[PDB]
Design a protein around this ligand. Structure first.
Ligand SMILES: COc1ccc(/C=C/C(=O)O)cc1
Lengths: 627, 625, 627
């Protein structure tokens, strides 16, 4: 039914993207990664790549040993300085001093995990003992030092894993605390039984022939990319809340009629956030965000399945086919799936960043943000509070560099190795630039998320102070003006609080101006003789009441509670504010926006945003609201 | 008659690029960098950016004190909390954990230096005392911690220099040994007296409104780029030396007739190396066209240098305080377009230089194109257990591909920023960062190529010695067993490394062309087998003894490189640094040898031997014929 | 003094960039191009490349014949099917059907001119007769058909010039009117004496070995680029006029203190426009335009000198050195100066386009354009006139594609021709993408220039109608209100005309609102009883007077004449409006913005914008105003 395996690949793209992320997070946090050569996922690669003391360990399935020993025994039967030479001349990378030219140790761990899983299928002719030794290195967090560059997708970097296994004099390894270790010391601390391995024929190739380094980092990258995409879907909805945008842009009819599944899910996710919210036309960063993100999600998801197939592949050469009693020469080391997927993912990451920059730009602009103060200024004095103006420039710098990284790597192939490798995938290089793009998207996600929480608090401030103004205006009108008191309060309804609240009784601001106009309108239809009195009484009472209401709110005793507390998006806000301690940014305090950004960005790097994010949708049935 | 200052700029681009590099190096090594707001060079920025204990210090010219105090007093006489707010909201950068999101402290020192120089002209309205404090931080190697990202070209990274000066609670500084310091501790170690500064009006803008970070690092990059450009020129000649290429490709007529000065100087530099080569006794484009290829790259790098050298002596403040007319001048000198343009153009030139190195390296290691050198430049007796630079060649392609990727520009990704008030911005520092990345990758290719050239040199030394050996014993077997004039001609023509691993191998040419040779003279046969039996019994012994003698340091014919003008770089790599001839019969790997050169290169130790290769050059091409 | 020729190259970068453009335009329009092998300029290449019947002809200097015959005679003395073979196998281009794969005929003419000038030096060993034959083809406008692609910088395209000279059966040529011609017909119509040439040794190489095609189109490109740069400098100043921006951004102190000569000239040019103008803080597209354009001009100018040296070079191989009696083998065919200069110019063209898009965006936005109507709407009814809204989207599409073309071509080199050409410059390809970028910049220049003229007329309308409102308001106040009449007119001074003029007496617009406020302010200090009367009289008179004033202006009889008539920028406006007939775009007429854009864009393609542009600066002394 499925001779070319199109069908089984299609079966993996069914279900919602969120569910995959939910499952992805679930198996990431499982305590044991069992390698059988067929079931490795990017979440398991990521979980192992972490050096945060999670406790995760790697186990090799004994069901695969028989196949591994068979191909190994086959090579010995068909038959050692050639293996020593292979590792020597491939040690051609450059470390220099420092870590700027060394592969990140978490990326080395990813490569080590993938390198094992791609050798368990049993077609590589390498001793199971070597696969067990690399597992000890992972479990005891003993990482060999690999060069950052030197591969076109990974003879050179992988040879530094073989160099540690064979006890090369130049081989170095890092301990759990950053200590430089010699090969002997590395073996002693990892518990590798016996001494250094004397590589048998084909064992050298089995270790260096393969795409594990590129595919390993691509797995780490795509794990973070799948989270950040969902985080982009939810933040677009939170963005629509504080922007008070028309929620019909999520209506399922609109998206159903495009058939794009990524767009339909994205709109359904946002609809679910807005459907449980207590809060010409809207601009594109808001109204078209489902159309904009849909394809990006479809790309990250499709790219995820490419890598997952790669990390469960046999990418060495030649293939030892015991069943047929012959070695098969091929080109499964050509890591084209890595370069293509990372180039496509990097562009999608940049498209996500562009939308976030566009949304952030709307949020901090009083021309577009529907009443919020310019720069999301939070202080009583807008002239001594410029809020996120500095962050807005940073967002432009983030986005600009993201669009530069969106360019591909795979269109720069060189005819290499005496033109024998006249085509090569550049996979790892692409994974490296896509990792850089994710980290910048994390910078943008940190800044954007803290701004939304600032806007949330400002909406909470708007409602409380708009009520205080109403009460004082009504109290003063009942005193003095006795249809005229009903129209006076409609003015307070229409005017944006943050257009006058820094000085409620300034004759140049719209409150006192439009209040007077309403009185003049009625006088023409003595209401004019009382204007002077009304403005005197209001000038004496309103400033005191506004200040009182703001202090009560700042003191935690608001007259009207923050509506976010009853929003489906509350967990993310609760996480930033309550759990992390991210504080309201105001020009009356010394705390700078960056200091608040550190908290979210650090936690986001520790994966602490996964739970509050998923909790915002945990009651979603995975379907749109009926139309 | 130079009202627009075109001519002053054109006068700067006269003389050779080399002389400019020699002056640039010599100034890098001066023990004192005196700032006057007008004479700052990239070499001075590079020398101060270094945190290597060189001892270089910074002095402020007292002549600029008056102008500085004038604009400072004018502002105060024109009249606080706004200066505290300015630095607060511009502290919008993210550091996280580690140093991945932190500006390298060397780049920070560069920014601090340029920041001082761009305020000494007297048009910024900032107290001289603050400039003196930053100078203490530099000379005491007390560096504030700046974020790597957050600017569109430097209100944000520059605000963290101001954050240190004002004693912000989140402000962090690092000591010479990497120890993190508080703003109070920094002032103590730095020697700054009086405590934190309470910024006066305009002083906040004076500190943060410059282009110092972008321009500061472009100076570091351009310093490295200027040197690597000359290194690429010299190595192209050494490449043409070990390749035995026709030196006719450096004939001045060819390059005189194109007029391009970069191509003329490049052709003339390689001509000087080849004209003084002891090997003196068509080619492919990586060799025959290298001057045409490198010429334009040096012109862009040299042009880009002058752009940045003007930027680091400019006044990028705003507003400018003009006391002579008693008013502030609002403009846009903070627009760092010269940084983004020069860095985009320079990165493309770096990529073109790297592309040439890759093509040359490829020719040098391919036995089809390297004129008798062994495939992969293998140095062992058993080529089946010595693949030489095959792994390095793969790394070169990886270095080259990522460089072509970085060759793309940054300045074509401008976003309409800050509520669309900054609807154009230069992105200079971002471009400086990517060009700096391209530079470090080119250092990887130069290290690998340079060590590869020394390998090729030792392989020509092995070839000549073993060519002489085979000739001799062939004449011995010829005189004793027997013709000779043709048999001896076979040895001179044939490539050593086509048969030397097994000279008398029937499948190899030496023990085949001699048969063909003897049979030819016979046809125009009974003495063949005896001569072969005599040669088979004697040639392995004589070859192994001469090869072992060369390995012990007492070869028959000495290495001709010692009598070449290119010897300084070989002596430095092979003798001074300890780099060793790579061979599969030992366990040392190519990387281990690359490490020695890359580290030395990262510390500037390649500069001296490089310029020494051209010390005797008069700066002009030798005459025609 | 100048052994490496750095000095003589530096001497060519002295003087103002404008002067070079002035000289450039001067020699472009000279009737004869005399080739001596040393003095060819891009303006002469451009003038010859034109097929517009300018009458320009090419003359070969007899001073060069001696050198040409010497090297030719030298080859014959040192010594023919090899020349026949060289041209045959290099005829490997593909034309297909149509012109999408054919080199533009003007680009072929550029290549032909450069190909001659690079063979007149006398080091190429080719018969002077052949150089004379190609000259006939140029003078009689007989152009061989060259393929668009097939060169990495030009064996293949140049071989189709040799194919015409040797009468190849596949060779085709185009006539002055587009007629396809065979080689025989081409010779007959051009007047080439004798039959087809039988190429002697080295003559085939002399024709195909060289960079003429890339350098030829680079010359055409840089001629237009030098004009468009000056046009960008002037339009930034005109932009500042209609924007009513602070002119101190051109103050020479600011730019003198950066030392950047391109910035100093750009600011001095703008200062000169504004210094003779009768017309939070300003934004960057305005205030930093000299900083932004300076480097772009320095790049185009420096790139110009690279190409001019290339078109006067000997780029064939081997070089026949008669003086030394030996042929010199080298690599002057490596067209690196072309690729580098075109890549750098393309980026600068994109930087110019980005600033223009930024400026256009400010101009059409009522939040930023300082009183002009949104979209530069010109009709009485803003709801039926959206002005340049459609053009603003087009500008974004222009700019976006320009930033894509800003990417380089020279970082995509392939190891070619059995890896003998392991490095190559890709010059022509780069020239082709830079030509595409210029044409898009022409689209942006057309649209932006017509918008400025729209804004000019709107400023003329603003002044006339603001005066009409003043007179009616004063006439009504003198009637009814008799310090109060002086404050009423100050309101008219402060309010932007186009914020209310479409309905001057709407109670929801700011005119009637802020007029009433001023009356109420005075009444509180009976002035209140007369408000109703004042608004009745104004409602009856003001609409009639506004309409009368607008018709008088539309009828050519404005009460106040258009201040542009006395501006140094008047020529460009006079050219667009008067000479070309570009009409005021108003939603009350059927004419669309594109129709007006055709006129300017067509004329700009015919070089008709050079004179009005230069006339705006013809009285500039080439120095900044004293500080
Ligand atoms: C991002 O925060 C900012 C933005 C703008 C400025 C002033 C700029 C000028 O003087 O033209 C200062 C700080």
């Amino acid at each position: 039914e499925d001779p070319l395996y199109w069908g089984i690949a299609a079966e993996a793209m069914t279900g919602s993207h969120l569910d995959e992320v939910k499952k992805m997070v679930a198996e990431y946090r499982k305590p044991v990664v069992k390698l059988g050569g067929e079931t490795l996922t990017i979440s398991q690669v990521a979980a192992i790549s972490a050096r945060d003391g999670s406790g995760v360990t790697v186990e090799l399935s004994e069901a695969a040993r028989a196949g591994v020993k068979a191909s190994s025994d086959w090579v010995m039967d068909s038959m050692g300085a050639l293996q020593k030479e292979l590792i020597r001349f491939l040690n051609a990378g450059i470390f220099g001093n420092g870590s700027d030219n060394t592969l990140p140790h978490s990326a080395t761990r990813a490569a080590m995990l993938v390198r094992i899983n791609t050798l368990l299928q049993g077609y590589s002719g390498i001793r199971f003992e070597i696969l067990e030794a690399i597992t000890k290195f992972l479990n005891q967090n003993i990482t060999p030092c690999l060069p950052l560059r030197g591969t076109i997708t990974d003879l050179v970097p992988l040879s530094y894993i073989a160099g540690l296994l064979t006890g090369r004099p130049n081989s170095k390894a890092v301990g759990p605390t950053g200590v430089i270790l010699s090969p002997e010391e590395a073996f002693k601390l990892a518990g590798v039984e016996g001494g250094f391995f004397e590589l048998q024929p084909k064992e050298g190739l089995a270790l260096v022939n393969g795409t594990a380094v590129g595919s390993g980092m691509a797995s780490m990258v795509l794990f973070e990319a799948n989270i950040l995409a969902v985080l982009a879907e939810v933040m677009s909805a939170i963005f629509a809340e504080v922007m008070q945008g028309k929620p019909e842009f999520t209506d399922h009819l609109t998206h159903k009629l495009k058939h794009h599944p990524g767009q339909i899910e994205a709109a359904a996710i946002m609809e679910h956030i807005l459907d449980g919210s207590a809060y010409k036309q809207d601009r594109y960063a808001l109204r078209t965000s489902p159309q904009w993100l849909g394809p990006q999600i479809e790309v990250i998801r499709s790219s995820t399945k490419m890598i997952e197939r790669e990390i469960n592949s046999v990418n060495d050469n030649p293939l030892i086919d015991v069943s047929r009693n012959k070695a098969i020469h091929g080109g499964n080391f050509q890591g084209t799936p890595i370069g293509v997927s990372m180039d496509n993912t990097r562009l999608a990451i940049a498209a996500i960043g562009k939308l976030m920059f566009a949304q952030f730009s709307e949020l901090v602009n009083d021309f577009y943000n529907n009443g919020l103060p310019s720069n999301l200024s939070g202080g009583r004095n807008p002239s001594l509070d410029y809020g996120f103006k500095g962050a807005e420039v940073a967002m432009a710098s983030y986005c600009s560099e993201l669009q530069f990284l969106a360019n591909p790597v795979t269109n720069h192939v060189q005819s290499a190795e005496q033109h024998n490798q006249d085509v090569n995938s550049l996979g790892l290089i692409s994974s490296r630039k896509t990792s850089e793009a994710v980290e910048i998207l994390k910078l943008m996600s940190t800044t954007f998320l803290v701004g939304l929480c600032q806007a949330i608090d400002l909406r909470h401030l708007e409602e409380n102070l708009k009520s205080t103004v109403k009460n004082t205006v009504s109290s003063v009108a009942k005193r003095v003006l006795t249809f005229c008191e009903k129209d006076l309060l409609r003015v307070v309804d229409r005017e944006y609080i943050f257009a006058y609240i820094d000085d409620p009784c300034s004759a140049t601001y719209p409150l006192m101006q439009k209040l007077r106009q309403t009185l003049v309108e009625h006088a023409l239809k003595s209401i004019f003789q009382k204007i002077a009195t009304f403005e005197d009484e209001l000038k004496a009472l309103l400033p005191k009441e506004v200040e009182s209401a703001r202090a009560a709110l700042e003191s935690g005793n608001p007259a009207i509670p923050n509506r976010i507390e009853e929003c489906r998006s509350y967990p993310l806000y609760k996480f930033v504010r309550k759990e992390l301690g991210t504080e309201y940014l105001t020009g009356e305090k010394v705390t700078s926006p960056g200091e608040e950004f550190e908290k979210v960005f650090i936690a986001m790097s520790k994966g602490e945003i996964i739970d509050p994010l998923l909790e915002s949708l945990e009651s979603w049935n995975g379907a749109p609201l009926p139309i």
